[PDB]
Amino acid sequence: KTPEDCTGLADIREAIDRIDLDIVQALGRRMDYVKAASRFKASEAAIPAPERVAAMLPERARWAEENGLDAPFVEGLFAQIIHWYIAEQIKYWRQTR
Amino acid sequence: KTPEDCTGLADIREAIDRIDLDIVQALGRRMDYVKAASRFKASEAAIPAPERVAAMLPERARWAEENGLDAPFVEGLFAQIIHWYIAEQIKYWRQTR
Ligand SMILES: O=C(O)c1ccccc1O
Ligand SMILES: O=C(O)c1ccccc1O
């Protein structure tokens, strides 16, 4: 149901649970691409790609802005996420070669 | 392209940007449902529903477990997301109710 067709918290919570599961499934598939990424790193030191992160974060802020969400909170959340995936990628690189 | 069909970082980053966009879009729609939730609350006090949050978090850990992601990271990320939405819902309630 749309937010305005929701008759109570049962409806609201079904939709929220679905959206959050979608997010979890996307973060899981995100990990697949991050591991695949390590095939195109020339060295371990290539992994963090700070210029790439610098480009990503304002992009995510813009998306926040365009979707009616506080840009600082979303951008900072994605800073945490991206740096966490980087850390995982390093660990994965080390463990698989 | 699938992670395994990606032929370089150009392909990897296209898919990651698509995934991160879907996540921002989903957080955007989630906000609509959180604000709609408020017309089913009594005062600033019924808003945080601690019994609801407590059931939510290990459900999110489980989904992370089933999607091959570190469960504390995902559980911790959602504690952060959920508590920020509660905050926004209180602000929203003050502003409109
Ligand atoms: O996960 C990412 O988005 C990322 C970005 C830059 C470098 C390494 C990474 O894992
Ligand atoms: O955003 C939520 O998931 C939430 C959960 C419990 C209480 C208030 C809320 O906004």
UniProtKB/Swiss-Prot annotation, chains A, B:
The keyword Isomerase applies. Keywords: Isomerase, Lyase. Optimum pH is 6.8. Substrate binds at residues 13, 30, 41, 89. It comes from the Bacteria. Residues 3-93 form the Chorismate mutase domain. It catalyses: isochorismate = salicylate + pyruvate; chorismate = prephenate. Changing residue 86 to T: 4-fold reduction of the affinity for isochorismate and 3-fold reduction of the catalytic efficiency for isochorismate-pyruvate lyase activity. Its EC number is 4.2.99.21, 5.4.99.5. Changing residue 41 to Q: Loss of mutase activity. 15-fold reduction of the affinity for isochorismate and 3-fold reduction of the catalytic efficiency for isochorismate-pyruvate lyase activity. GO terms for biological process: chorismate metabolic process; pyochelin biosynthetic process; salicylic acid biosynthetic process. Inhibited by endo-oxabicyclic diacid resembling to the conformation of the transition state. Pathway: Siderophore biosynthesis; salicylate biosynthesis. Dimer of dimers. This is Isochorismate pyruvate lyase. It comes from Pseudomonas aeruginosa (strain ATCC 15692 / DSM 22644 / CIP 104116 / JCM 14847 / LMG 12228 / 1C / PRS 101 / PAO1). The gene is pchB.
